[PDB]
Amino acid sequence: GPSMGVQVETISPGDGRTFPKRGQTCVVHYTGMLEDGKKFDSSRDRNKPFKFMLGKQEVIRGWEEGVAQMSVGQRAKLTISPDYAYGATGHPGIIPPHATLVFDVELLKLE
Secondary structure, X not given: OOOXXXXXXXXXXXXXXXXXXXXXXXXEEOEEEEOOOOEEEEOHHHOOOEEEEOOOXXXXXXXXXXXXXXXXXXXXXEEEOHHHHOOOOOOOOOOOOOXXXXXXXXXXXXX
């Protein structure tokens, strides 16, 4: 009984009173790295932040439940599992089956 497959760790404290609401877009920079630390997709590498809407399901479950735990100006690392990321199949070549992923997002601003 571990409960919840998403672990977020605060690295840089932001506002602490400004969390992203459901329905609005969230501008944040992420970094996807395998369990070993091998990158597979970063938003900052292309010099462009990632904007998404909460509750719209435009992103992964571990992101909607994890990003909502941080406040504007906060930098935390979210641990996503193959159950919260894609499933038991995943994406062939980049995301293998039964594999844990690591993503580092930073709360820049809200739209």
